[PDB]
Design a protein around this nucleic acid. Sequence first.
RNA 1: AGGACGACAUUAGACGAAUCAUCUGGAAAGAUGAAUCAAAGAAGGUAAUAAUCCUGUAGUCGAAAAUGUUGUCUCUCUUGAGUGGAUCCUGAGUACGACGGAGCACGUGAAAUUCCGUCGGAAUCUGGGAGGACCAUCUCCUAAGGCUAAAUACUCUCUAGUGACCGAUAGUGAACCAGUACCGUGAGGGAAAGGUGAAAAGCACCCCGGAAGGGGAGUGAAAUAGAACCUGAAACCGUGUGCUUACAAGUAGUCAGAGCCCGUUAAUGGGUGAUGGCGUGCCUUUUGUAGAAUGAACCGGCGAGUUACGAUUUGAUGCAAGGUUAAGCAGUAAAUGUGGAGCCGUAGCGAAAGCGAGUCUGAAUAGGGCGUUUAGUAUUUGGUCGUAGACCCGAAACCAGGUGAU
RNA 2: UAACUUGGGAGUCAGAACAUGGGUGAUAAGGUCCGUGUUCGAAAGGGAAACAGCCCAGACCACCAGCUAAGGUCCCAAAAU
RNA 3: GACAAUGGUAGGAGAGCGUUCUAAGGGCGUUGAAGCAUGAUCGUAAGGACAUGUGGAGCGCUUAGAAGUGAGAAUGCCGGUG
Lengths: 116, 145, 204, 64
Amino acid sequence: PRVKGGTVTRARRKKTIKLAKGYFGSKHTLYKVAKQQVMKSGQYAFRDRRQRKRDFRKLWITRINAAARQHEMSYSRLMNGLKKAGIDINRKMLSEIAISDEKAFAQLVTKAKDAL
Amino acid sequence: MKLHELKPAEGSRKERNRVGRGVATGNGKTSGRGHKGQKARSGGGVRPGFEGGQLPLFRRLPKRGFTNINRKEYAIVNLDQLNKFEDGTEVTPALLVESGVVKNEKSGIKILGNGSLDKKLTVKAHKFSASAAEAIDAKGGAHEV
Amino acid sequence: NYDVLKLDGTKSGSIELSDAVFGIEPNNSVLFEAINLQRASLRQGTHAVKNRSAVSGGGRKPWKQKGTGRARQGTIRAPQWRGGGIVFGPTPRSYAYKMPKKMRRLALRSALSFKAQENGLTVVDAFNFEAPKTKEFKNVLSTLEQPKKVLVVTENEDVNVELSARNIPGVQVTTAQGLNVLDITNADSLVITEAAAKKVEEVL
Amino acid sequence: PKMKTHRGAAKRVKRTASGQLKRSRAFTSHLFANKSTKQKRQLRKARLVSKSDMKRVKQLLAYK
RNA sequence: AGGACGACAUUAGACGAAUCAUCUGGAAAGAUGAAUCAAAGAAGGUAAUAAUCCUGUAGUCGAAAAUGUUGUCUCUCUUGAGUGGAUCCUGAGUACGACGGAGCACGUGAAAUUCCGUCGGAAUCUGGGAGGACCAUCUCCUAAGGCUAAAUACUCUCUAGUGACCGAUAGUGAACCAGUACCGUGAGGGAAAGGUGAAAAGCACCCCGGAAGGGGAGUGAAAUAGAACCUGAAACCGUGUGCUUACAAGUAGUCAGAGCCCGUUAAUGGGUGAUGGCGUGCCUUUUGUAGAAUGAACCGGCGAGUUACGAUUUGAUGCAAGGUUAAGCAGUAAAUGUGGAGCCGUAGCGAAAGCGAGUCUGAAUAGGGCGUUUAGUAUUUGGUCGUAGACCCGAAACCAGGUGAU
RNA sequence: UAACUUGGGAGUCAGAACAUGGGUGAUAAGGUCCGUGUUCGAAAGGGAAACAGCCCAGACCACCAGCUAAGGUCCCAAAAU
RNA sequence: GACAAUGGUAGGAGAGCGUUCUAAGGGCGUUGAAGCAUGAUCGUAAGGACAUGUGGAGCGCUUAGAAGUGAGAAUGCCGGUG
Ligand SMILES: [Mg+2]
Ligand SMILES: [Mg+2]
Ligand SMILES: [Mg+2]
Ligand SMILES: [Mg+2]
Ligand SMILES: [Mg+2]
Ligand SMILES: [Mg+2]
Ligand SMILES: [Mg+2]
Ligand SMILES: [Mg+2]
Ligand SMILES: [Mg+2]
Ligand SMILES: [Mg+2]
Ligand SMILES: [Mg+2]
Ligand SMILES: [Mg+2]
Ligand SMILES: [Mg+2]
Ligand SMILES: [Mg+2]
Ligand SMILES: [Mg+2]
Ligand SMILES: [Mg+2]
Ligand SMILES: [Mg+2]
Ligand SMILES: [Mg+2]
Ligand SMILES: [Mg+2]
Ligand SMILES: [Mg+2]
Ligand SMILES: [Mg+2]
Ligand SMILES: [Mg+2]
Ligand SMILES: [Mg+2]
Ligand SMILES: [Mg+2]
Ligand SMILES: [Mg+2]
Ligand SMILES: [Mg+2]
Ligand SMILES: [Mg+2]
Ligand SMILES: [Mg+2]
Ligand SMILES: [Mg+2]
Ligand SMILES: [Mg+2]
Ligand SMILES: [Mg+2]
Ligand SMILES: [Mg+2]
Ligand SMILES: [Mg+2]
Ligand SMILES: [Mg+2]
Ligand SMILES: [Mg+2]
Ligand SMILES: [Mg+2]
Ligand SMILES: [Mg+2]
Ligand SMILES: [Mg+2]
Ligand SMILES: [Mg+2]
Ligand SMILES: [Mg+2]
Ligand SMILES: [Mg+2]
Ligand SMILES: [Mg+2]
Ligand SMILES: [Mg+2]
Ligand SMILES: [Mg+2]
Ligand SMILES: [Mg+2]
C-alpha cells in the first residue's frame, strides 16, 4: 500500500514555528530558519542555566563586598572571618541580609572581626 | 488464543532496521557505509575473494587430484544401529530400508564395526568391515555378501 | 467425555473424544504461526509500480550536461522528477509459505483443544435438514443457545445445512476435512455432529 | 538464482569433517634446484586454509 | 466430401422474499421501540450509515434468428493372419574422410555425438550405425523420405470476477474532446487541466455603474455552496490595533529584568520589552570551515538499502537418530490432504583404487595430518553476503536501425 | 579489573598541532620523514583578548547552594589598591 | 535501601514514537467524522489529549500482521509566491 506524505509534516513544522513565536521577521515565519533558531535557543538555554548560577553568585559577592566596605572590611577578610567563626550563611543570604537589615549584618561583621 | 489477542512466541520476531531515515537512528545519511570509496557506492564493492590485485589465494595455490568416474560409495550401517533388530532376525538391505536405518543405499550396504553388537543376527550386506564380520560371527550370528 | 444433544437441546447421549486431539494443551506459538500463515496465504499480491524503465518516454537527455546552469539530468522520468519512475515499490509476489506437517496438525489440535477447554464445543447427533431453511437453522442455533459466532462441522458436505446456515451472519459451515485454524479460532463455539467428531478424531 | 561455486577453489580444496578446508602447497611446481631438500620435503605436506583467508573466501565454497 | 435429427452453450430478456412508528434533522437508511424474510446479510443507489424503498442478490424460467461445441443415424473408406528360408528389395554423390568454420554446458582439445562450404568417397543383413579418440568382444539400434493431436508459450481482444494495488504531483503520457495543445524540415518529443447543490431550486425585483463588479431582496440546511462554485495549509500581500522603537555597532537568540497591557487547558499565568551578561546560521567536505570552500530565494508537494532466488549466521518453533518433501493431484486463486522422487543428517580418511572408527603418508605395530569418543533437520523473524540496475541522481562516450542537402 | 577463544556486524587506510629523541632542510618553515607522550579529530566547560591541536578539566537532568583547578584579585571585570 | 556508571564522529547493539493498509475485538459520528485554525495541555524523546472556531461524512481505540512508512539541503523535479 502507498503512504502519502499526509499531515505529519505540517504538524511537526507548525510545532517548530510556534516555538519560534516572537522572533524577528522570517525567523518566526519560515520553518528552516525558525528550526535553526530554535536549535540555537536550546543550546543557549542549556549553556545559560549554568551561566546563571555564576552570574548570581557574582552579584551576591559584589553586594557583600559593598556592605563590608561600608563596615571598613574587605569581602575577602569578611569571608575568612565568617569561616573562622563557623558561620555558614551563604552569599545569597548574606546579600539579602545586608540589603534588608543592616544591624544584623553589622553583628555578623563583628563576629567575623572577632574571629580574625 | 483469539484473533484480537494474537501473540508470537517471545523472541520470534524483530523489527527490521531501516537506514537513511534521520540521524537519531544512528544509520541516517551515509546509512552505515561510512564516507566515500568504492564500498560507499550503490552497487559498490569488489568481487568475493578479490584481494585488490594481489594474486588471490585460489590462484597462488595449486590444483590437486581427479574424480573417479566409477567411484563407489556405500551406505554405512554400524553395529550400534543393528542393535535394534530382534535376535534371530535376517537383516537385509530391504529390511534396513523399511526400518529406516538406511535411507539412501548409494552403491549398497556396508556394515562397519563401530559400537557393540548385542544380538545374534543373520546380516546380509554387499560389504563388511573385518571388525564388523568378526563381531557378527562372535555374537553367534552369520554374515553373507 | 462430552454430552451429545439433539436439535431440540435435549441430551441424545454421550461421546468419547480423544484427549490427544481435543484435550491437549494448546501450543500458542504453533497456533500463531498457523494463523499468520493462513492469513499470508490469503493475499493476492497483485500490486505494481512503474520504475524509470517502465514509465513512457524519457529516452533523451533533457539538456546538455554542462553550461546551462541547471542541475544535470539524464531523463525526464528519473525518480526525483514529477511523473518519474518509482524507486523500488510494490512488485507482484506471493506471501504464502509452508510449515512442517506435524506443526500444521499440532495447530489444528491446539485450536480444537482451546475450544474444548473454553467449553465452546457442542456435539449434536445429526442435522436432519431435508430442505434449506435459514429460519429453522436459526431456531436450532437458538435452542442450542449458541453465541453469535458459530462454526458448524459436518462429517461430509451437507448441502442443506450449508444452504440453511449460509445467510446467517456469524455462522460458518465446514466439514471435518475442511477444518482450519482461522475458522476454529474465529468462531466462539463449534457445533459438530457425532460422525464429524469421530472423523476428526480419526484424522488428527 | 542459486549461488555459483568458485570452480578453481573447488578444484583446489577439500572440506574436512570439522568444516575446515584442506589445501595443497605453493612453490611445488618447478625450480626445485633452488629449494632445499627440507623445504621440498615439508612443502610436500598439505595444510589448511587460514582463518583470515576463510573470512574472505567462505561464500565461494558454500556448496562444497 | 456431405446430409438429417437431437442436446447443450453464446449473443436480448422474465419472475424473484421481507418494515413500520417515533426523535434529531433540510432530508433517516442513524438512534430508539416493536416486527418480518433469508437457497436472497454480494453490491450499488435513494436528501446521512438500509437484508425488508429502488436497481439488484439466492433461486427459477426464457429465444424468432445467427453462431459455436457435441451425440446418434447417415455418409465414406477398408480384408486380416501363419509357414519357408532358394533368389530379390530395404532411401548414394549418400554415410564417411581431409581442410576451413559452426553447433553441442564441452573455447580443438584425447574430442565422440551434429551441421555448412570445398575436394575426395563406401558397404549392401556374413550389411550398416552407436555405447565420448581408437580397436576387439558384447549390448542396443536400423541413417541418408514424409505425417502426426495432447500435456507447453503468449494476450491486441471479449465475458464474469478478484486485490492488506493508486486515489488527481498518485494511478496509464492521457479520470478532463491526449498522442491533443505545443515544439521540430523530419524521424520524433510531448504536457497542463477532476469536485456548486439532495434537487438548478443557477439569484424575480430594486439600487450604484457604460460594462465589470458590488449592496440589498430572494432560492437553498448552507451562497460565509453563485460557476475550475467541497475543504481551503504555507509562502506572499493588505487594514486596524496592545506593547515598543529616532545616541544606536545587532548570526537577531538566550539568561537576567523594571515599566505598560491583558486574563488562561488556573498554571509558583499570557503579550510586549528600558536595560545588563553570554553568543560568528545550517548542511556538506575536511587535519582544520564564521568561513571569503559547497548547496539552498521562500513555501508546499514529490524525492534514495527494495524485492526475488540462493548462501551464511542468530533468535523462535516442531520433530529427533532422524528431519523434510518438490513437481503433481484434490481443494475456494485458501488452509489443508495426498505425493518420499529428491535433499540434509546418523563416518571419516585418501588424488584414487580403496579401507573404515579409523584412514592417509610411510619399509614401519614409528612419528605426523585429518577424524572417533552425538545432534541433526524443516520452516520462519533479524543481520550480512551473492546473482539481479541492487540506496538515489549525473557523464563524456559505444553500437544498432531510422530521419535530414528548405 | 581485566584478559583470552569462537562466531555475527562494522568503520578506518588524507590525519593536525604541541612537547621531546632523531634524519633531511639552512641546529629555515604553521616544511618534510620516523621514535615517544598528550590533546584535537570525535570534547562542551574555565584560562591563554579573540584563538581545533597550548594550560586546567571530561557536560545524565534540574537549583538564584558550597569547595577548588589553571589563571587571577586598581577600573572595564568576580576576588588583596 | 545502598553506590557505580551515563561527552562523542564513522560505526555496532537495544528500546521506542508516528504514517497508510489488513484481520479480529470493542467503539465514535449530522446532538457534527476526517481535514484546517487557535490555545496558557500532557509525556524523558519521537510524540499524545482536551476545548473552541471552521468543515460537512467519515474515523478512532486494542492486539496482531504488512509496508510506496517519516526530508532541510541532491546548482534535486513540479507548482505557487517573493
Ligand atoms: Mg513529503
Ligand atoms: Mg559551578
Ligand atoms: Mg544497526
Ligand atoms: Mg532498533
Ligand atoms: Mg554515531
Ligand atoms: Mg556499517
Ligand atoms: Mg556523502
Ligand atoms: Mg576519505
Ligand atoms: Mg570506507
Ligand atoms: Mg542560479
Ligand atoms: Mg506516475
Ligand atoms: Mg610438479
Ligand atoms: Mg423484478
Ligand atoms: Mg423511516
Ligand atoms: Mg426487492
Ligand atoms: Mg573440422
Ligand atoms: Mg565412434
Ligand atoms: Mg561416426
Ligand atoms: Mg566407450
Ligand atoms: Mg535388439
Ligand atoms: Mg502439439
Ligand atoms: Mg490509498
Ligand atoms: Mg486535493
Ligand atoms: Mg502526466
Ligand atoms: Mg493526469
Ligand atoms: Mg472552495
Ligand atoms: Mg534613544
Ligand atoms: Mg541533515
Ligand atoms: Mg584543505
Ligand atoms: Mg557559506
Ligand atoms: Mg566541490
Ligand atoms: Mg547560492
Ligand atoms: Mg520548499
Ligand atoms: Mg542490495
Ligand atoms: Mg539546394
Ligand atoms: Mg607539518
Ligand atoms: Mg605533509
Ligand atoms: Mg606525535
Ligand atoms: Mg576526521
Ligand atoms: Mg576546546
Ligand atoms: Mg573567553
Ligand atoms: Mg561524564
Ligand atoms: Mg572587583
Ligand atoms: Mg554517552
Ligand atoms: Mg518514502
